[PDB]
């Protein structure tokens, strides 16, 4: 008389679990990502990447390039009026 066994005939529902979808995602998501890297590209040399590093990083929101660009325009147009217009 019927000796039927559900537990080891569950083996196609043991792939069926929902976090498996997350698992196979995040072994691939974590197959190459650096833990935090060593020191990637925060600073670089484009000779204006150095400018960016001091002023236009997340390291500095300092108002200094704005000031610099402002002062440039003040220097620019006063001489230039007599040269162009």
């Amino acid at each position: 008389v019927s000796t039927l066994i559900p537990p080891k005939v569950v083996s196609s529902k043991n792939i069926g679990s929902a976090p498996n979808a997350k698992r196979i995602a995040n072994v691939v998501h974590f197959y190459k990502s650096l833990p935090q890297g060593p020191a990637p590209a925060i600073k670089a040399n484009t000779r204006l990447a150095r400018y960016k590093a001091k002023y236009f990083d997340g390291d500095n929101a300092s108002g200094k390039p704005l000031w610099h660009f402002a002062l440039g325009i003040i220097a620019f147009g006063y001489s230039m009026e007599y040269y162009f217009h």
Binding site: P19, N26, G63
Partner: protein, 52 residues
């Protein structure tokens, strides 16, 4: 010069900005940066749980 009076007012304006706004905008930026990081770390925790 006429326009040098205008340049003095502009200097006062940029001073007021550096006084008030540059720290405020720093704080604003800071608040958001924290929030991004916190969401990120939350997801990191979340998947570590699922594995276990």
């Amino acid at each position: 010069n006429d326009e040098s009076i205008l340049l003095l007012t502009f200097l006062g304006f940029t001073g007021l900005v550096a006084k008030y706004l540059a720290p405020a905008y720093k704080d604003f930026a800071d608040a958001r940066m924290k929030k991004v990081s916190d969401v990120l770390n939350a997801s990191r925790n979340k998947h570590v749980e699922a594995v276990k």
